[PDB]
Structure 1
Amino acid sequence: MPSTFFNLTMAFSLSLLGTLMFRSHLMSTLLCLEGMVLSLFIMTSVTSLNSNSMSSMPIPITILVFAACEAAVGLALLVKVSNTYGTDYVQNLNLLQC
Structure 2
Amino acid sequence: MPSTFFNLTMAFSLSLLGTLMFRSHLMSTLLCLEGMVLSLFIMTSVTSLNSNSMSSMPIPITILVFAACEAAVGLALLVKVSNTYGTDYVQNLNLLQC
Report the TM-score, using the length of structure 1 for normalisation: 0.97
Question: Unaligned stretches of 5+ in structure 1?
Answer: none
Q: Deviations over 1:1-40 (max 9, x none)?
A: 1111000111110000110001111111111001111100
SS of 2:23's partner is coil
Cα drift, residue 63 of structure 1: 1.1
Q: Number of residues paired by the alignment?
A: 98
Q: 1:62-77 to 2 correspondence within 5 Å?
A: 62-77=62-77
Name the Cα RMSD after superposition.
0.7
Cα drift, residue 42 of structure 1: 0.3
What CA distance in whole angstroms lies between the structure 2 residues aligned with 1:88 and 1:33? 17
Question: Unaligned stretches of 5+ in structure 2?
Answer: none
What CA distance in whole angstroms lies between the structure 2 residues aligned with 1:27 and 1:2? 32
Report the TM-score, using the length of structure 2 for normalisation: 0.97
- Greater share of residues in helix: 1
Runs of 4+ in 1 over 3 A off after TM superposition: none
Q: Deviations over 1:28-87 (max 9, x none)?
A: 111100111110000000001110000001111111101111110101001101111111
What CA distance in whole angstroms lies between the structure 1 residues aligned with 2:94 and 2:70? 23
